[PDB]
Amino acid sequence: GKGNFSACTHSFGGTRDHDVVEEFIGNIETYKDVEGISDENALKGISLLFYGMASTWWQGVRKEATTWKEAIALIREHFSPTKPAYQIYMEFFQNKQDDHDPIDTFVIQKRALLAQLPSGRHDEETELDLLFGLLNIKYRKHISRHSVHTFKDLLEQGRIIEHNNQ
Amino acid sequence: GKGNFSACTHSFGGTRDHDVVEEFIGNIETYKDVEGISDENALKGISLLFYGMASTWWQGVRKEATTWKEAIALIREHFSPTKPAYQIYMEFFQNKQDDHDPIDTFVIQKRALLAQLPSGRHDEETELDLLFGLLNIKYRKHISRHSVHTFKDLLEQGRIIEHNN
Amino acid sequence: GKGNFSACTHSFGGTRDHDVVEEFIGNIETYKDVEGISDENALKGISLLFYGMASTWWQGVRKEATTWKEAIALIREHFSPTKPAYQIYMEFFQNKQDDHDPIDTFVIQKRALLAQLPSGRHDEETELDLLFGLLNIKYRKHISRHSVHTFKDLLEQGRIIEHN
Amino acid sequence: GKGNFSACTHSFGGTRDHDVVEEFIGNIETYKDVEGISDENALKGISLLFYGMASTWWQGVRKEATTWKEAIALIREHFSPTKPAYQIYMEFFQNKQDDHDPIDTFVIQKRALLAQLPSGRHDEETELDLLFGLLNIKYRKHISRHSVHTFKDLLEQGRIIEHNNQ
Amino acid sequence: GKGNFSACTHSFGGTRDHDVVEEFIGNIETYKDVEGISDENALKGISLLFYGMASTWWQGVRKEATTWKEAIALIREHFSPTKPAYQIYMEFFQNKQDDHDPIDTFVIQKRALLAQLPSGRHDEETELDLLFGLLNIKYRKHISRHSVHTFKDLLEQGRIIEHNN
Amino acid sequence: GKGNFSACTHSFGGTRDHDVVEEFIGNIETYKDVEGISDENALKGISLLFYGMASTWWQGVRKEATTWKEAIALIREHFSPTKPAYQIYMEFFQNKQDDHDPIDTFVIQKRALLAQLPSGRHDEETELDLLFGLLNIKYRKHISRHSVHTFKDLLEQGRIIEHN
Amino acid sequence: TTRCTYCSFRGHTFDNCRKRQKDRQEE
Amino acid sequence: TTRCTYCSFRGHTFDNCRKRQKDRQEE
Ligand SMILES: [Zn+2]
Ligand SMILES: [Zn+2]
């Protein structure tokens, strides 16, 4: 299954946010792994994925690279610093649950913010312990910490306690 | 024997209902069967379909999946709860038919709401006996309960009573 | 062949009339026969065509369907009631053709509506004798019932009289 | 190159004009000749090209046909009579050229109306003779019948006489 | 090795110019070269592209064609006349440049209008000598005719005279 | 391979700036090199990319082009004039960076604009000494010219000072 | 330039488009 | 039902469409 980058529909501009750079790097890497392009052939044709605001920057620093990993690391370094751990822990305990959001959206967002720490440092139990201190008073007064036995149960008891009109 | 999902027009933003999740899962299945993509080469590309809240949700739970079957099971499990027994019975007796509604739509809705109970729990006779007690007065003054059996006849008597009026 | 309905453009709603349901069933059958799909494989894919109210109706009665024949039988029986004779006789003889309607459009509808009666109860002669009582004064003054015999010559004489 | 009618995008309704029926029959015949479908296989699947207003008519007269030519002739007979010659000759001499249209559009329309007569009954010279009696006075007073030598010349002299601002 | 033109987005309604006919003929050529359709199998399908006046025109002249080459020649011949010699020279001297127009657009237009004469009839020197006598007073008061040769220099002197002002 | 430009999405108008023409020429060259099109075959298809005023310009000078190299040479020479030095020196030192512009955006533009001078006339030291005279008061109070040496450390110290 | 309003293709105008005129659209 | 206003496909809404959001459109 020979191929190259010519057909790809993804592209990246000069935006200086974080989510855009992360989604772009992830999509490009998954495409390169799925279509079977060679590990070195891709570097010779990467220039077809840049707008008019970043092409000058790529022209300015082409020679400070030799293999694909260095180029991806260089993009990440210049356009958006990676988050260190302490800022993640700081963000997790800031905004406590409001008085209107359903439990499902809260659990989804908190789980989405907790996967960015290095893998294997936290198994299921301590994660459930960290999450349990911020729930709003409507749920804490019925369900307790005696019986949770992982996440799948907490959503179930929360849904049954939510259908009952509080 | 290879390809991405990038060509599709379907996307699932996340809403707690049944018809939307069912139609989306069916369209994705037909697409994967038609373009020939294989099972383990297909899971890697699944991320391109989700958007909005569904993207954050898939970013959450990802290490619990391993093959295509687990992914469909997780989507169906988290985005369309199975209603327990008693709520269906409670929903069933809280909505009598109005004066302005043909027999067909009413019987079709009340039948569609009854198939979610566990299979084999009911007989055609007991179900039809349950269906009465809600029909509006315009139809109950003619057809009698001991002159009908299967569902094929109630629609017939209702149509003849409707056309005369 | 490509044993699935995935390429089809046909669809069906909740409408209640003989013509739409008839053309729908005929198109699905001819598509099943021309492209070589297997007799049994089609049933798993039938659910992809319905939309709106029809999807709820199909959710209501999946348990009874088994093979390919009974599904079309269920469609025709729940959306195609065998109208009893007297309503058909009343619906015919209503709405005499107006001055503007051409002879061909009027003849094709009145013959399509006369096929729902039980089979074999009428020959061509009595059928044409029934039809020859609603044409306007314009077409009737020239042709006369003794002239035309079969059910085809009336179209020819009507076309030649309608040319002017 | 096996195939059938399933993929065709052409279709026909119940309209009772003439140009629609002619264009439809021509497109369907050219498609059947180009894609190589068998001469009898097409008749078994012709029903996929009709709307809801003509499908009842096709259901009503299916049995009075046996081969493809009879079916096309039957469609032409029921939905739109073919034009006999005398009406064509009558239409040709009705509306003389106006006082504003350029010569090109007039020659194009008159040539379009003259190809429907049976082929080989009229060669180039008599056709040029028939066309020449209806031109507006602006052109008849310069170019004459002495030199025409077929159509390509008449358009040329007319264009040079038209660029000169009359 | 077979297929119809039905998939295309191009259509030619008939207008007496040059750019439209050229772009349309080029797009049709690239399409036929890309999808692999052969020459004699392609002429039969050509009717689907035309619409409006072009359809009646193709219905007119059809027996004079036999292969693809004759069809392109007929379209080019009937829908884009070749202008004779004298009209180009007349058009060329009836439009002096205005005060508000950069040198580049003017030189590009006047050069584009001169290539329709038969090839080999002119020298670079005589053409550049013809080009003067129309430049507006803002530029003729500095650059002198005996200080320029090829077209590469006139643009240079015009740019330096423009940036100073 | 598919020896034609038919699949390309790139286009070019009549704009006059270094960046657009540069990115256009670079994209066309990389596309010509990656997909294996022959060195000579591309020239016949080059006309399908231009639009608007550029098409008229290409109509004006077809006679001079011959092979693949001279076409890009003509584009760069008619749309890419080699700016003389003094205008570049005047354009630099104009528009001192404002309070809002981040250090990375400002550094990349000022270095991209300094490459048009004739090659080899300046080493890294004098270049950095020229650049270090337009930064705002905010970044200058902490770092000092004796500290930074090469052209890379300034970005690091600026980022750490910009984090707060 | 003049991108077809309906099909979003740069090849023609609103009045005439294959999807809109035929292909049993306009229902 | 709710045919996508731009791409003319029955699969989503105006706000989010592959051609309009990205694919270097909105020029
Ligand atoms: Zn369009
Ligand atoms: Zn869309």
DSSP string computed for D76-107: HHHH-PPPPHHHHHHHHTTS---SSS-HHHHH
Q: Please, do chains D and C touch (3+ CB pairs < 8 Å)?
A: yes
For residue F39, with 0-12 CB atoms within 10 Å meaning exposed, 13-18 middle and 19 or more buried, which class applies?
A: exposed
Token representation of residue F162: 């910009």
**What SS3 string covers chain A?**
CCCCCCCCCCCECCCCCCHHHHHHHHHHHHHHHHCCCCCCHHHHHHHHHECCCCHHHHHHCCCCCCCHHHHHHHHHHHHCCCCCHHHHHHHHCCCCCCCCCCHHHHHHHHHHHHCCCCCCCCCHHHHHHHHCCCCCHHHHCCCCCCCCCCHHHHHHHHHHHHHCCC
Domain boundaries, chain E: 2-165
Cβ–Cβ < 8 Å for A52, F27? no
Cβ count within 10 A of residue A6: 14
What SS3 class is residue E22?
helix
Q: How many other C-beta atoms lie within 10 A of the C-beta of residue C73? A: 12
Chain F residues whose CB is inside 8 A of the A5 CB are 34
Distance H10 CA to ligand 1 centre (A): 17
The 10 Å CB-count burial string (b at 16+, else e) for F84-97 is eeeeeeeeeeeeeb
Distance (Å, whole) CA B72 – CA B27: 13
Tell me the two tokens of residue A117. 């720490």
Task: Note whether D59 contacts C30, CB cutoff 8 Å.
Answer: no
Please report, to the nearest 10 degrees, the dihedral formed by the alpha carbons of residues G15, G20, G26, H1 taken in order: -130
Please name which of D48, C23, E19 lies closest in space to residue F59, comparing C-alpha atoms. E19
Query: What technique solved it?
Result: cryo-EM
C-alpha span between A57 and E80 (Å, rounded): 47
d(CA D135, CA D158): 11
Query: What CA–CA distance (Å, rounded) separates A75 from C86?
Result: 82
Beta bridge partners of F50: F12
Which residues partner with A80 through β-bridges?
A: none
Best of A4, A21, A48 to substitute, by most chain F Cβ atoms within 10 angstroms, is: A48
Residue D99 forms beta bridges with which residues?
Answer: none
Whether chains A and D touch (3+ CB pairs under 8 A) is answered by no
Neighbours of chain A (3+ CB pairs under 8 A): B, F, H
- What are the respective helix, strand and coil percentages of chain H, to the nearest 5? 15, 0, 85
Chain H residue closest to G1 (CA)? H27
CA E47 – CA E58 distance, rounded (Å): 8
Number of neighbours of residue C62 by Cβ within 10 angstroms: 10
Residues lining ion ligand 2 (Cβ < 5 A) are: H 4, 7, 17
| Burial profile D118-153: b = 16 or more Cβ within 10 angstroms, e = fewer | eeeeeeeeeebeebeeebeeebeeebeeeebeeeee
What is the C-alpha to C-alpha distance for residues B156 and G9, in angstroms, rounded to an integer?
53
Q: Distance between CA C46 and CA E164 in Å, rounded? A: 77
**Which ligand does the CA of G21 lie closest to?**
1
CA distance C66 to C88: 34
Neighbours of ion ligand 1 (CB under 5 A): G 4, 7, 17
- Indicate the SS3 state at residue B99: coil
Distance CA B92, CA B111 (A): 10
First to last CA, chain F: 54
Q: For residue C60, list chain B residues with Cβ-Cβ distance below 8 A.
A: 108, 111-112, 115
Query: Does H16 sit within 8 Å of B11, measured CB to CB?
Result: yes
Angstrom distance (rounded) from CA C43 to CA D13: 31
What number of C-beta contacts closer than 8 Å exist between D and G? 7
Which CA distances in Å does G27 have to B129, C25, C127? 42, 20, 37
Residue of A nearest to B5 (CA): A31
CA G11 to CA G25: how far, in whole Å?
20
- Report CB contact under 8 Å: A48, F26: no
How many beta carbons lie within 10 A of that of residue E164, not counting itself? 7
Which residues from G are below 8 Å from E10, CB to CB? 11-12
Chain B residues close to C41, C-beta within 8 Å: none
DSSP state of D12: B
Query: Within 10 A of E125 (CB to CB), how many other CB atoms are there?
Result: 10
Rounded Cα gap, residues D19 and G17, in angstroms:
19
Instruction: State the Cα–Cα distance between residues D73 and E35, nearest whole angstrom.
Output: 35
E119-E123-E124 Cα angle (round to 5)? 115
Looking up tokens 């693949």 gives F68
Backbone angles phi, psi at A121, to 5 degrees: -85, -10
Using a CB-CB distance cutoff of 8 angstroms, which residues of chain D are in contact with residue G23?
9
C-beta atoms of A11 and H18 within 8 A: no
Nearest to A41 by CA among A3, A7, A90, A12: A3
Give CA angle at H5 (G27, H7), nearest 5°.
Answer: 100
Separation between Cα atoms, residue B159 and residue C78, nearest integer Å: 12
Asked if the Cβ–Cβ distance from B81 to A108 is below 8 Å, we say no
Residue from the list D1, D34, D105 with its beta carbon closest to the beta carbon of E44: D34
Give bridge partners of residue C50 from the DSSP assignment.
Answer: C12
- Whether there are 3 or more C-beta pairs closer than 8 Å between A and B is yes
Contact call for A and E: 3+ CB–CB distances under 8 Å: no
Of F59, F54, F101, residue with least CA distance to F78: F54
Min distance F57 CA to chain A CA atoms (Å): 24
CA angle C34, C39, C45 (to 5 degrees): 90
Of all residues in chain A, the one with the smallest CA distance to B43 is: A34
- CA dihedral F7→F10→F11→F17, nearest 10 degrees, is -160
The identity of residue C47, as a single letter, is S
Tokens of C27: 């198109």
d(CA E89, CA D80): 56
In a mutational test of the E interface, the residue from D8, D22, D28, D30 whose CB has the highest number of chain E CBs within 10 Å is D30
CA distance readout (Å), B82 to A161, B22, B87, B117: 16, 13, 11, 10
What sign has the CA pseudo-torsion F140, F145, F146, F152?
A: positive
Least Cα distance to F156 among F109, F104, F97, F101 occurs for F104
Considering only the beta carbons, identify the residue of B26, B112, B163 that sits closest to C59.
B112
Report the separation in Å between the CA atom of C49 and the middle of ligand 2, taken as the mean of its atom positions: 22
Question: Using CA atoms, how far apart are residues B100 and B82, in angstroms rounded to an integer?
Answer: 32
CB contact under 8 A, D108 and E47: no
Whether A48 and F27 lie within 8 Å, measured CB to CB: yes
Three-class SS state of B33: helix
Stated in angstroms to one decimal place, the resolution of this structure is 3.5
Q: Long-range contacts for F152-156 (Cβ within 8 Å, ≥24 apart)? A: F154/F107, F154/F128, F155/F103, F155/F104, F155/F107
Q: CA end-to-end span of chain A, whole Å?
A: 57
User: Which residues of chain E have a CB within 8 Å of the CB of G4?
Assistant: 9
d(C-alpha B53, C-alpha A109), whole Å: 9
Number of other CB atoms surrounding residue F101 within 10 Å? 11
